[PDB]
Paper text:
S-layer proteins (SLPs) are self-assembling, crystalline proteins coating the cell surfaces of many prokaryotes. We determined the atomic resolution structures of all functional domains (I-III from N- to C-termini) present in the three S-layer proteins SlpA_ac, SlpX_ac, and SlpA_amy. The Lactobacillus S-layers are anchored to the cell wall through interaction with teichoic acids (TA), either lipoteichoic acid (LTA) or wall teichoic acid (WTA).
The arrangement and architecture of SlpA_ac and SlpA_amy are highly similar. The N-terminal part, exhibiting the first two domains (SlpA_I and SlpA_II), is known to be responsible for the self-assembly of the S-layer protein into a regular lattice. A second interaction was observed within this crystal structure, a symmetrical homodimer interaction spanning from Asn92 to Asn176.
Author numbering: 50 to 210
Amino acid sequence: DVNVTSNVQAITSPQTTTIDNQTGAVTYSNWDGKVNGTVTATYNGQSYTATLNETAGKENSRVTPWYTQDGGKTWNVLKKDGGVYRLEPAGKYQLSVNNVSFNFGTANANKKNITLTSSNGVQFRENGQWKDSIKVSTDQNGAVSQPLTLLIPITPVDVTN
Ligand code: NA
């Protein structure tokens, strides 16, 4: 059993401060978010960093941000605005990335039906759905045999908090 945890953090900062002079209230706007961190897997007591495909071809790993306007019934691709990503604090966002792997080492070679799960909301693409678990195999080197597509949740933390 593998526990896939996310350490992906989103830090967001306001470019504009507004003061309503009828009340004195301060309002922050024009958010400028930046995502950082990694996804780690814990297996048999050791931790492994998710890897991304960096080739020129089609299998190159693609990081795509998503935002919902409702509670989660509609998601769309978060496009840049003013050359930045407008991540609003406490806003529901998700990251999708394809062709992820793990290198579990030669001690974990030729294992079959290893169960991937997550303790903080990471989901795995398979059969057109997002699932909370998936089975994978390792090759002769201990690397996961098939490319993995993850959905990584992120809640941006307000730097002004
Ligand atoms: Na005033």
